[PDB]
Structure 1
Amino acid sequence: GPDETLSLLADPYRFISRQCQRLGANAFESRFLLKKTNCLKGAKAAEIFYDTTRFEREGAMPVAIQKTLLGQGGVQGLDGETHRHRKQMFMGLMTPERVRALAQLFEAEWRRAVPGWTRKGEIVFYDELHEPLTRAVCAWAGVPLPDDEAGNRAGELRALFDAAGSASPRHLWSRLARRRVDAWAKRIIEGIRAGSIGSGSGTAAYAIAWHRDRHDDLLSPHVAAVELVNVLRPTVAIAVYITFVAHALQTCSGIRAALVQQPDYAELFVQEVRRFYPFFPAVVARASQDFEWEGMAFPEGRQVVLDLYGSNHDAATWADPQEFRPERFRAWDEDSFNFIPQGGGDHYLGHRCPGEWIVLAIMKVAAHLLVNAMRYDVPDQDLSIDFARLPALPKSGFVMRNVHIGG
């Protein structure tokens, strides 16, 4: 078959579901770079993708991603009992109490940032979110962050994910940002271990610095650093979802009113933001043994990609996936495979995002502040979603004018 790396890169979110629609199937064989790849979409495909007797992650992460978005040696590249033991370290962080504490820190940081936004007169909303998130998550995680370094650290964390999937000199900045953030996080881990940094026993940095692997050994300092970044970085990336929350409030009639008046609505709304908007395009794994599924061959070693966006827009599951309708979540049965913006399956037994509770809690804070606290004007701008960008964003970045929180 032809190599279609370029076709995929031009339409990273929609390429798979578009081909699926043309072929009338939920799976097709393709090729990206050197590797024949089976592309999968939908609930049944997600269920097989998360079967760890048939799929492994070892060696599926590209070098370019190790050097930017994810780092080297982290939980994403692990399988089996080694993976599950490392995953438990992240899950232990996510108690209702700790998630609430992070949400509260983020509201405080958002409120702290508003006067700056007022004084600026006009802001790019997306651009302004990274720093308050950075401040909140570092405080929550037990990571010291001097006031005069917060801006710079926020830019470096942003560069790991916002510049990672950019085929421009921005990728070179992403690589440098990765080297810097690893060295910084490593100094944090070392200081905790030496006792020079007093992170509390409940905090992410403490848990990661003192984690013991399956042989009762501490993580090497570089791996501990990478895992700490695996908490800090994607929390800052919630800027993307917060921007989409603002976008939905601006472009979908009746949403603001429903959020204002109906109490149970916020939960439905943030879930629909995660379903509707493109963010994490797709996940990659490798077949661990020969098998056949739905008449498709999966030879041992075959690269397989699971299309998250397409799955979240599958008409078989949702009926009218093209509409933004929070109400649809009244009928959801909490299935582990049919709604997968942050992965599918089980959080402990597979690679599903442990950050979901944090994401939901922070999106709820954002929705609350944007409807009940913030006042802002939205000038004429290009609000259309850039499906060519990784991560996707409204083309304008969501521009606000005359922002205040006292009214």
Structure 2
Amino acid sequence: PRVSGDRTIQFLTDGYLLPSNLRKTAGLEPESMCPVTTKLLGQDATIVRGSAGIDLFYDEDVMQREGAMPPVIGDALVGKGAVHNLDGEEHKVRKAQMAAMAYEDERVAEFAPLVAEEVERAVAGWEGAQGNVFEDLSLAFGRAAFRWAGIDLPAENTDELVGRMITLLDNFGTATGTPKAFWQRRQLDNWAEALITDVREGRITARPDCVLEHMAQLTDASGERVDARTAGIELQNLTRPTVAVGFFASFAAVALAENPQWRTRINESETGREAFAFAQEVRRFYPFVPMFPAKATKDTEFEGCPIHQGQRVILDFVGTLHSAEEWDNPASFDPERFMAYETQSEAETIKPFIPQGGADVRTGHRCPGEKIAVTALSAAVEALARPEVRISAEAIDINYSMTEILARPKSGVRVTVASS
């Protein structure tokens, strides 16, 4: 199944609709698990979804990541030289040092009280006032992330830097926004490089064993220290993605307005299980990652389709999270599908549940921040569900576009907290 012509522009105009549009244009039936091949940026690109597509995408014998992401996205979103671009042993060594910070249960347990504290502070600012879920909880997450990482700055400096990360996250994916994203990337990179260099030269003392200290000590596979700008880029890769949970927190507010019986179950629970399952179904249901790219390292073959060395393989995330072959009633928002699960570690066993990637965190490229993200999103869900929180139901607060990346309600979701 091919679609003719170069569809680079159609990737921009369709956003999250691109993979299902191309499958339709190729003549596949709805719910087909057949690959579809198009041309993107001058080369073939084969879009796959579902469990067999996950296995291909994460097979590092045949897939590499270097060069797979277009730099206009990647250089702005993750920075040059980031772990996302690395392959083989250099990737393994870099990923081990970053997963040691984000994915270890002891460090996640350090983050939990910080994000609960910052979320409660944001929600307190809504009392009798006009709040914004996306802007205010993204800022709360960023404040928690900076304190968690040991980035110790005056309050106004932290807020300004988190503000830059929000502006970057809110703009990297459109033609109008990309110069704004690249400007923020340069300022943030300059800031993080100077902070890393300050720690390495003794001008700033990091808390022992904190994330900032471990990023200043970042080394490569030969044993040499990674240059200071790249280490600052990796420090951002352990704080900016936490700010980005604000997108999921916006959707969670929409979902609580739309599911009042689940909201009641959360408010009446003492276990946290409903809020956890609700947070997971927000990540399953709502669009965040549209798709993700890799490049073939050698000629191979997937379900009768030839894969040429150098071409892209694109894992369709929306189509995997919404596949009728992988999920019962995938168009239904239904937290019951996660109610039997207790932790994010247990949720990893669900093979098509890949909102932040698939396969294994330490041996592959899968996101090492899912425990952090579910912790932050769960804290948001619990606070948003409380009955004094009044979530606006107007069309600009509740609806969101599927043709723009990243997606969120246009208003950010307006909220207020009832006060006497």
TM class by shorter chain equals over 0.9
**Alignment deviations for residues 170-197 of structure 1 (CA, whole Å, 9 cap, x no partner):** 3212111001000111111111111222
What is the deviation of 1:337? 3.3
What is the deviation of 1:361? 0.6
Mean Cα deviation higher: 356-365 or 369-378: 369-378
Mean Cα deviation higher: 24-33 or 330-339: 330-339
Mean Cα deviation higher: 313-322 or 23-32: 23-32
**Alignment deviations for residues 321-348 of structure 1 (CA, whole Å, 9 cap, x no partner):** 0000011125787446311100001001
Matches within 5 A, 1:4-403: 4-20=7-23, 22-24=27-29, 25-26=32-33, 27-93=35-101, 94-118=103-127, 121-168=129-176, 170-262=177-269, 263=271, 264-330=273-339, 334-335=348-349, 337-372=351-386, 375-382=389-396, 383-401=398-416, 403=417
TM-score (normalised: structure 2): 0.91
8 Å contact 1:284–1:304 — kept in the other structure? Answer: yes
SS of 2:415's equivalent? strand
Q: Aligned residues: percent identity?
A: 34
What is the deviation of 1:265? 1.6
In structure 2, distance between residues paired with 1:344 and 1:114 = 33
**For this pair of structures, how many residues does the alignment match?**
403
What is the deviation of 1:261? 3.1
**Alignment deviations for residues 240-269 of structure 1 (CA, whole Å, 9 cap, x no partner):** 111111111011242102222343222221
Runs of 4+ in 1 over 4 A off after TM superposition: 330-334
Question: Structure 1: which 5+ residue stretches go unaligned?
Answer: none
Residue type of the alignment partner of 1:219? V
SS of 2:47's equivalent? strand
Residue type of the alignment partner of 2:274? Y
In structure 2, distance between residues paired with 1:280 and 1:41 = 13
In structure 1, distance between residues paired with 2:61 and 2:93 = 17
TM-score (normalised: structure 1): 0.94
**Alignment deviations for residues 275-314 of structure 1 (CA, whole Å, 9 cap, x no partner):** 0000011110001111111110101111111111110000
What is the deviation of 1:138? 0.9
Question: Structure 2: which 5+ residue stretches go unaligned?
Answer: 342-346
In structure 2, distance between residues paired with 1:95 and 1:303 = 32
Residue type of the alignment partner of 1:388? T
Residue type of the alignment partner of 1:355? G
In structure 2, distance between residues paired with 1:156 and 1:197 = 22
SS of 2:337's equivalent? helix
In structure 2, distance between residues paired with 1:337 and 1:56 = 21
In structure 2, distance between residues paired with 1:225 and 1:66 = 16
* Root-mean-square deviation (Å): 1.9
Residue type of the alignment partner of 2:316? D
Q: 1:379 to 1:348 in 2, by over 3 A?
A: closer
8 Å contact 1:39–1:304 — kept in the other structure? Answer: yes
Residue type of the alignment partner of 1:316? E
SS of 1:376's equivalent? strand
In structure 2, distance between residues paired with 1:67 and 1:302 = 20
In structure 2, distance between residues paired with 1:379 and 1:58 = 44
